[PDB]
Ligand binder design. Structure first.
Ligand SMILES: NCCS(=O)(=O)NC[C@H]1O[C@@H](n2c(C#CCOC[C@H]3O[C@@H](n4cnc5c(N)ncnc54)[C@H](O)[C@@H]3O)nc3c(N)ncnc32)[C@H](O)[C@@H]1O
Ligand SMILES: NCCS(=O)(=O)NC[C@H]1O[C@@H](n2c(C#CCOC[C@H]3O[C@@H](n4cnc5c(N)ncnc54)[C@H](O)[C@@H]3O)nc3c(N)ncnc32)[C@H](O)[C@@H]1O
Ligand SMILES: NCCS(=O)(=O)NC[C@H]1O[C@@H](n2c(C#CCOC[C@H]3O[C@@H](n4cnc5c(N)ncnc54)[C@H](O)[C@@H]3O)nc3c(N)ncnc32)[C@H](O)[C@@H]1O
Ligand SMILES: NCCS(=O)(=O)NC[C@H]1O[C@@H](n2c(C#CCOC[C@H]3O[C@@H](n4cnc5c(N)ncnc54)[C@H](O)[C@@H]3O)nc3c(N)ncnc32)[C@H](O)[C@@H]1O
Lengths: 261, 261, 261, 261
């Protein structure tokens, strides 16, 4: 069907893309980067994250595939030498799709702006002190003082979340996970410390105490927001879909990336 | 209906129990500690854990309630001054039940023994070095060397799991969480470090490498097991049921126990 | 002798300052904010840090005293109600001095700039990815990828260092302590993880890998540095001196600020 | 002079020992395992720790050397292929000695018993709950509830201490470091959390609250102590001496064992 291919842009990835397009030319496959049904990302996890954000308005009619030309690749779990086999299997269809949960971030002012994250959304101050009230389903939970906060999807838990001490969650769990960045805890200031895991339909609201300017990141797109009244997190209703051609379990992916390969 | 009441055994809890039995005597309520449908625990979380294990063969036909006579009480979320109101509301019924997930531990030898946990199951060595192979759904994930491992239920995540760096999970999530106790990590020895969160139907198997004697705890019942071939963890099919008379959200309970009250 | 008094600037601190100046007027004491031998700080630890940086060129001929008008005060360990007693005892002299170690930061370009820290010096990137080579006494120790690094004095270990997982060190130990901010650790990227404690005369050098713009903080004075070739840390030869009138041990200060008071 | 050689006891180490004894036979060197001046350990760090405890009454007249026949070896920093060169250089003398600090543990009852540690001393309960009052220089600092406590020497900081979150300290610093094992922290129970670093002459006393039976380990020699009134820690006046023939800096040793080699 309709497909497109993004590339990290180095020689290796560009030529792989050109060879895959040539192999696709031998089947009933049309290159269309406006309304593809298949998005192939060639590069690393950064390249894959860009492909997701490029098509985040047609997530429900798209299956993603990642090919890793360098190292790691939690999302890009295909090797370049298997590109010919991928073309052939993907051309013949008959593949199953798997779906990972997404995170919805809403930023209110004094209008509304919403974002979708595949890894995480983080909040930090505008250079001054970061102080926010953390409100869980309209219940004031804690006043956070520190460097910032990170809300991760399940597939994002192996990324920034992991570096902050968070737990690794299997992506079949529809949840989001909040981790602290360097909170103050003395006799006067008090946070929970532990990462927090939230189910679907729970809403986590960050509300400013004094300064209302914040740096908000969504999958490493980092934007300064001014005059912020509230930042709201919830598990999205939308999901990302992966074309899956082989069994490559999440815990094996974890083993391969952090333990050994 | 049929009910019973356990007590921590100090003067305060015993007299509260005797006064509640007297108040129940004024309704169609029968004291039966063989087949109760309502189990009231008067004491702390330890007392409540004992009540759960006392009736763990009739979990599906029992609703539990906890009254805290001292401090904390994550499970015992009723104050003693509200005992009269509890009797009256519980006598009139018309209460909703809420269900928390449980953890199943299977210990194999060279027969099989199974246990149910409301907080967690932990494994440590018999005094020597603890070394186990961690196998996730029949896939070898890591060789663990250290003091031990802890597998927590969701409601258990605020207990031992929390002290080990684990995340706090809302009990509506059907999952179990594995945390490490003091693992060795150098050039030769390698674990994941992070807590791991597993969905229903995932099986985590611990398999001995050399020594096969282990200390296995289930909710602080600690038993030396000899000639162990495998320890298997999975989210149980059984659930604990709480009689709920008021809204007391999990995250408020967390706030009250760790942040302030 | 010569003395001056800084104030946090709120009503409480200003009037305390004016009353102490009036009490000093009754002794052989001269208000001199150019070459004081005694510097009194009235406010919190921020106020005290400003007093230290205001006089950091005459550290060897100055004894500092802090009065805390609000909460905490690890450096400002005097209560406002004891201001009259402080004036009297300080006017009569006969006090012992205690000295805490300091941290020297050198920033090289492509000239040299040096700074003194009482709490810590931290390094972060200019908004992009932070990557530095960590070189210990001219030996390449690790390539750090993450949010940043923090080098703390001993008295600074209860501040930012503590929030980053660092150890609390008694200030009689002449040392500096390096902590990581959220480092990446996978199969490709590798840091030590643990805080590192360095003796006098050890030199820790941070050397850029790609980007050479960094945000460098010295006691929460945060300055963007461009064209950086090296950041060097070592225990300073200079020391801060406190006028001490009573026994208030460091570990009691720690107990009072973090455990209870 | 007088020397002896301990072996891990496998074929590799025994034959290396026999070949080194043969090479020593060609110089003015006498095998004496009663009053050696040189103790060579052939094996791993466990073997080296046994050699230290075997001669801990003559520490001041002995220089230790370790040869690692397997992996790691923080104390045994010689490779087997350099055994001939070691014999020759050690026979000709003209080597410098380096000294590492030691930890003194005193256990009081209701008599006194003292121990020396090269890595650490740890305390755990006798199977029940571990509760101790932590007293620093006769000042009550905290009541600890949890799995146990670990007091490390500087060279011990890369061992158990590291797995507990402690900082790595250069062995030229005369200090000991206290780390917690899984402490409870809620509204009722409160510890400092952070590792604590103590200078020479500071005394840390553990005092029982209820149960007075404890498992006390000194360099992995673990002994059940009954009727304990106090456990006292201080930096020892004694030191271990290493024969050093080459420059092998501590931070390079750390790099080689944890980062890469
Ligand atoms: N490009 C500059 C940010 S880089 O320098 O930290 N590199 C990112 C590294 O991660 C890997 N990665 C990614 C990715 C990616 C693209 O970057 C943006 C992402 O970078 C993360 N990030 C930011 N600051 C971090 C930090 N201090 N520590 C750890 N990660 C950090 C954050 O998640 C963000 O979305 N998603 C996952 C995943 N799902 N599972 C496991 N690993 C993952 C990626 O393969 C690379 O190794
Ligand atoms: N009795 C001797 C073990 S006591 O000394 O550590 N006390 C237990 C403490 O905890 C609280 N608690 C419990 C409970 C209980 C009954 O103990 C058995 C349980 O004690 C836990 N435990 C063992 N070693 C621990 C340690 N080092 N740190 C922390 N907890 C530890 C473990 O979970 C076990 O099931 N379940 C939860 C819960 N669901 N949420 C939040 N808090 C909870 C309880 O209120 C008390 O404060
Ligand atoms: N003003 C905005 C930064 S504030 O919002 O984090 N507040 C600082 C807090 O700390 C206390 N404090 C200070 C102080 C001070 C003045 O700030 C500048 C300092 O703020 C520290 N800081 C920055 N980001 C932090 C973070 N995420 N977590 C913890 N501390 C952080 C950093 O050390 C810097 O020098 N020195 C020490 C000390 N010696 N012992 C124990 N406590 C200390 C101070 O009493 C206050 O409670
Ligand atoms: N034999 C059973 C205990 S073994 O299974 O944990 N193995 C010990 C491991 O360590 C290394 N090691 C040693 C050593 C040794 C001999 O064991 C006794 C020591 O084992 C330590 N130990 C106990 N439980 C631990 C745990 N959970 N995590 C980490 N270490 C633990 C404890 O320090 C004790 O003295 N001193 C240091 C050092 N100075 N620098 C760096 N590494 C060091 C050694 O090379 C080996 O890799």
């Amino acid at each position: 069907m309709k497909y497109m291919i993004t590339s990290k842009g180095d020689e290796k990835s560009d030529l792989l893309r050109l060879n895959m397009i040539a192999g696709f030319g031998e089947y009933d496959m049309e290159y269309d980067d406006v309304e593809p049904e298949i998005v192939i990302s060639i590069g690393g996890d950064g390249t894959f994250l860009s492909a997701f954000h490029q098509y985040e308005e047609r997530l429900d009619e798209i299956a993603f595939i990642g090919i890793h030309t360098g190292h790691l690749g939690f999302y890009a779990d295909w090797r370049p030498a298997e590109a010919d086999k991928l073309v052939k299997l993907l051309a013949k269809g008959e593949y199953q799709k798997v779906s990972y949960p997404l995170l919805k971030t809403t930023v209110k002012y004094g209008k509304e702006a919403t974002y979708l994250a595949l890894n995480e959304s983080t909040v930090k101050s505008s250079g001054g002190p970061f102080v926010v009230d953390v409100v869980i389903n309209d219940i004031h939970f804690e006043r956070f003082r520190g460097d910032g906060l990170c809300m991760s999807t399940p597939s994002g838990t192996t990324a920034y979340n992991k570096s902050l001490g968070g737990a690794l969650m299997h992506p079949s769990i529809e949840a989001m996970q909040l981790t602290e960045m360097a909170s103050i805890n003395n006799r006067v200031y008090r946070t929970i410390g532990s990462p927090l895991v939230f189910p679907k339909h729970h809403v986590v609201s960050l509300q400013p105490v004094n300064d209302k300017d914040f740096q908000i990141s969504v999958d490493h797109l980092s934007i300064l927001h001014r005059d912020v009244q509230e930042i709201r997190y919830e598990v999205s209703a939308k999901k990302i879909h992966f074309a899956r051609f082989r069994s490559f379990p999440f815990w094996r992916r974890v083993h391969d990336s952090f333990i050994e390969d």
